[PDB]
Each structure stands twice: as structure tokens, then as C-alpha cells.
Amino acid sequence: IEKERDVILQELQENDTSMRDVVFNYLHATAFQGTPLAQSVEGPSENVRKLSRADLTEYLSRHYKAPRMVLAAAGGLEHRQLLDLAQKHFSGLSGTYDEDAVPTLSPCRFTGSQICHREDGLPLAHVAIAVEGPGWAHPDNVALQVANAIIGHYDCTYGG
Amino acid sequence: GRQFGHLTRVRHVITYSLSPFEQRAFPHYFSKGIPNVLRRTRACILRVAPPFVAFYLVYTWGTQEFEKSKRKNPAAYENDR
């Protein structure tokens, strides 16, 4: 707990190095403020210090029962010879399904806004722009794939 | 050079703002603003008004002072002699 915490506190402060991974999270909080969706994966530096493994076990407890769980594999295996040696753990150890609410998620807020952190030292400014879009499953999910196929993309060293 | 680019050097300021559609053109306009009237209307009024008041007196003061000076001849000398 302390090793990782220190290791993580190491990382959290080191993660500031790549402007790329920097700018993203800003964008989430930009529109998705008001819902957990926007928050950091790694969260505030403080909970990093402030975490007891109770919450862990507790969050271990809630969300690791099925349907939440999904299992697969691929290779020379077909199915049967998997399903036999699938079977009993993890038939199983449950991995359960009871409630733990259901399946709790909420519509996240889509906010027209801006974020500007002005710093004049570095050579360049990573800038990206976005607007909200449809969910996973939808026909439109297809068309958008070709939408970006149109613009293409350029960088320095392409032989373009 | 290019007006905005080379202006100045600035470090570690951050700004937060919304689309204008996100909000309204009257976020408690009445309620919030009406108090503000005083802190500005009291601020200068200490420094500014009084000189005019002096003027306004002079306005009536001299006029009145003027008025007698002509208006009534049988005043200093009445029409006796």
C-alpha cells in the first residue's frame, strides 16, 4: 500500500511530462463536469495517500461479480476443450449476480465550454477540439468511422 | 510582431468558461446587481457632488443679489428724492 502509493506519487508527479496525456483529461472535465465520467483515472493525488484497502475490498466487493465479468481467449483453442477446463472455479466462485445496484450508469452532461492553461515556456502547444457524439451501439457509429477517413492526418516525418 | 503572438510572456494562468448558451442573460440581474448600485454610487459621491451645491447657491445667491440691485429703484433711494 505504501510502496505503490509512493511509486504512484512518484508517477503522478512524473506523468506531467507528456503534454498529450495532459490535455485529454481537461477535455473530459470540460463537457463532462457533473458526472464521474470526466474524472481522472488515477484520481486526486490526495486519495492516493488517503486510501484504506477497506474501500478496495469494498470496491473489490461490489463490481467484480458477474455480469460485470466477461471471459474469452483466442488461439488454437476451439471451444469445447476450453469449456471443459473452463469450468469449476469460476463456474463458480461467484463472481455472483445479486444486485450491487444496476448497472449503475447515468447520462453524462455535454457542456459547451473552454479550458485554457496558458504557459509560455514550452516550444509548442498541443491543441485538440471536440464535440460530443452517439453511444457505442448505433448505425451512426458506422458513418462516423468513414467521416474521419475523409480528413486524413499529417505529421512531420510522413513521406507525404 | 504578429499582434498577439509576441505580446508578453506569461506563465501558469488558467481560465474557465462556458458556451453562452449554457447560461442566461439575466442570472439574478435584479437581485444581485441592485445592491452594487450603492458601493459605486457611494464611492465617488463623497468626492464629487459638494462643489456643485456651492454653485447652485451662487446661482440663486447672485441672482437674488442681482435682483434687488436693479429691480427696485425706490429701495436705496425711495421715490422721495
UniProtKB/Swiss-Prot annotation, chain A:
<comment type="similarity">
    <text>Belongs to the peptidase M16 family. UQCRC1/QCR1 subfamily.</text>
</comment>
<feature type="modified residue" description="N6-acetyllysine">
    <location>
        <position position="88"/>
    </location>
</feature>
<feature type="modified residue" description="Phosphoserine">
    <location>
        <position position="52"/>
    </location>
</feature>
<comment type="subunit">
    <text>Component of the ubiquinol-cytochrome c oxidoreductase (cytochrome b-c1 complex, complex III, CIII), a multisubunit enzyme composed of 11 subunits. The complex is composed of 3 respiratory subunits cytochrome b, cytochrome c1 and Rieske protein UQCRFS1, 2 core protein subunits UQCRC1/QCR1 and UQCRC2/QCR2, and 6 low-molecular weight protein subunits UQCRH/QCR6, UQCRB/QCR7, UQCRQ/QCR8, UQCR10/QCR9, UQCR11/QCR10 and subunit 9, the cleavage product of Rieske protein UQCRFS1.</text>
</comment>
<protein>
    <recommendedName>
        <fullName>Cytochrome b-c1 complex subunit 1, mitochondrial</fullName>
    </recommendedName>
</protein>
<feature type="modified residue" description="N6-succinyllysine; alternate">
    <location>
        <position position="3"/>
    </location>
</feature>
<feature type="modified residue" description="N6-acetyllysine; alternate">
    <location>
        <position position="3"/>
    </location>
</feature>
<comment type="function">
    <text>Component of the ubiquinol-cytochrome c oxidoreductase, a multisubunit transmembrane complex that is part of the mitochondrial electron transport chain which drives oxidative phosphorylation.</text>
</comment>
From Swiss-Prot, chain B:
<keyword id="KW-0999">Mitochondrion inner membrane</keyword>
<dbReference type="GO" id="GO:0021766">
    <property type="term" value="P:hippocampus development"/>
</dbReference>
<dbReference type="Pfam" id="PF02939">
    <property type="entry name" value="UcrQ"/>
</dbReference>
<protein>
    <recommendedName>
        <fullName>Cytochrome b-c1 complex subunit 8</fullName>
    </recommendedName>
</protein>
<dbReference type="GO" id="GO:0005743">
    <property type="term" value="C:mitochondrial inner membrane"/>
</dbReference>
<dbReference type="InterPro" id="IPR004205">
    <property type="entry name" value="Cyt_bc1_su8"/>
</dbReference>
<dbReference type="GO" id="GO:0030901">
    <property type="term" value="P:midbrain development"/>
</dbReference>
<keyword id="KW-0249">Electron transport</keyword>
<keyword id="KW-0813">Transport</keyword>
<dbReference type="GO" id="GO:0021794">
    <property type="term" value="P:thalamus development"/>
</dbReference>
<keyword id="KW-0472">Membrane</keyword>
<comment type="similarity">
    <text>Belongs to the UQCRQ/QCR8 family.</text>
</comment>
<keyword id="KW-0812">Transmembrane</keyword>
<feature type="modified residue" description="N6-acetyllysine; alternate">
    <location>
        <position position="32"/>
    </location>
</feature>
<dbReference type="GO" id="GO:0021860">
    <property type="term" value="P:pyramidal neuron development"/>
</dbReference>
<dbReference type="GO" id="GO:0021548">
    <property type="term" value="P:pons development"/>
</dbReference>
<comment type="function">
    <text>Component of the ubiquinol-cytochrome c oxidoreductase, a multisubunit transmembrane complex that is part of the mitochondrial electron transport chain which drives oxidative phosphorylation.</text>
</comment>
<keyword id="KW-0496">Mitochondrion</keyword>
<dbReference type="InterPro" id="IPR036642">
    <property type="entry name" value="Cyt_bc1_su8_sf"/>
</dbReference>
<feature type="modified residue" description="N6-succinyllysine; alternate">
    <location>
        <position position="32"/>
    </location>
</feature>
<comment type="subunit">
    <text>Component of the ubiquinol-cytochrome c oxidoreductase (cytochrome b-c1 complex, complex III, CIII), a multisubunit enzyme composed of 11 subunits. The complex is composed of 3 respiratory subunits cytochrome b, cytochrome c1 and Rieske protein UQCRFS1, 2 core protein subunits UQCRC1/QCR1 and UQCRC2/QCR2, and 6 low-molecular weight protein subunits UQCRH/QCR6, UQCRB/QCR7, UQCRQ/QCR8, UQCR10/QCR9, UQCR11/QCR10 and subunit 9, the cleavage product of Rieske protein UQCRFS1.</text>
</comment>
<dbReference type="GO" id="GO:0021680">
    <property type="term" value="P:cerebellar Purkinje cell layer development"/>
</dbReference>
